[PDB]
Amino acid sequence: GIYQTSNFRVQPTESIVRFPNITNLCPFDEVFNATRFASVYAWNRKRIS
Amino acid sequence: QVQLVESGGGVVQPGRSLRLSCAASGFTLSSYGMHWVRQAPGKGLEWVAVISYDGSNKYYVDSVKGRFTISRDNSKNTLYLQMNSLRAEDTAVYYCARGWAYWELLPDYYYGMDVW
């Protein structure tokens, strides 16, 4: 006669991830490589967003 | 070139009012502080008033409190001193000075008046 035993499936080989590009960086060099610094008392308070 | 023009000088009846004008060329007043210094013949220089780069606060000397006013205009790059209720001891030569900038961050009670 005819009978059914089970199923068969192909497995994926690798994985890939994508994202909308990386051009939009936070300005960080101007803080680390700054022309001048702040004093021991008082300090500049910068906001990054 | 950094050049400052002091105009409006004159001799007026005591107790009257007059407005002194200063012209700044080569830079912008909005980023710097100004000093007004008077010097009488036969005497030493006498500090009068200052204006900060941001215009948040104003300081005068005790001899000029409540009688003169200082003002600035960023649009035309012009500096105005309002002299009111003049007294005979005010005979001096007034100089308009330029102080350091917020461009160069320095501690409080700022240091200024390097060229005028």
Domain extents in chain B = 3-116
Mutation target among B102, B103, B104, B105 for the A interface, most CBs of A within 10 A: B105
How far, in Å, are A48, B21, B108 from residue B80 at the CA level? 38, 5, 25
- Report chain A residues whose CB lies below 8 A from the CB of B104: 36
Task: Count CB neighbours of B103 within 10 A.
Answer: 10
Solving technique: cryo-EM
CATH C-level class of B3-116: mainly beta
- Report chain A residues whose CB lies below 8 A from the CB of B108: 42
Look at residues B72, B76, B82 and name the one whose alpha carbon lies nearest to residue B52.
B72
Task: Count CB neighbours of B32 within 10 A.
Answer: 21
Contact (CB<8Å) A36/B107? no
- Report chain A residues whose CB lies below 8 A from the CB of B105: 36-39, 44
Q: What resolution (Å)? A: 3.8
Q: Where are the alpha helices (DSSP H) in chain A?
A: 29-32
Q: How far is CA B27 from the centre of its chain?
A: 16
Size of interface A-B (CB pairs under 8 A): 11
Contact B9, B20 (CB under 8 A): yes
